[PDB]
Design a protein around this ligand. Structure first.
Ligand SMILES: CC(=O)/C=C/c1cn(C)c2ccccc12
Length: 118
């Protein structure tokens, strides 16, 4: 019929698809606040604000073997990464910058892969 691009294709393609998005999002210069692991009190205001701390170092870990195969599961965590930084980081900081730049890249990429869910 026509072209709308707004629906994943089976868990097989979607699986590696999330693995590709992470490969780019993580490889993106604006991913160091999530790619590498963070300390425990190195973040200005952590634990007592982030209900579910998350980072890219954990996604690729499970996504590698078999975990983020769904569209909402991956989007939830990944989206939790961009907001988590934006959460404990003030309005003026490099953490938010790279998090807002990569987050923009993420939404666009998924917007084209008919992903996104919650
Ligand atoms: C994106 C996220 O959920 C958590 C990021 C950080 C957690 N900690 C403890 C940090 C310390 C420094 C910088 C970033 C973080």
């Amino acid at each position: 019929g026509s072209h709308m691009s707004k629906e994943p294709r089976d868990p097989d393609q979607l699986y590696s698809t999330l693995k590709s998005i992470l490969q780019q999002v993580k490889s993106h210069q604006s991913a160091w606040p999530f790619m590498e692991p963070v300390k425990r009190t190195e973040a200005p205001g952590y634990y007592e604000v982030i209900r579910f701390p998350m980072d890219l170092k954990t996604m690729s870990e499970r996504l590698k073997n078999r975990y983020y195969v769904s569209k909402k599961l991956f989007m939830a965590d990944l989206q939790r990464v961009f907001t988590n930084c934006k959460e404990y980081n003030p309005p003026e900081s490099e953490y938010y910058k790279c998090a807002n730049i990569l987050e923009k890249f993420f939404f666009s990429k998924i917007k084209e892969a008919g992903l996104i869910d919650k």
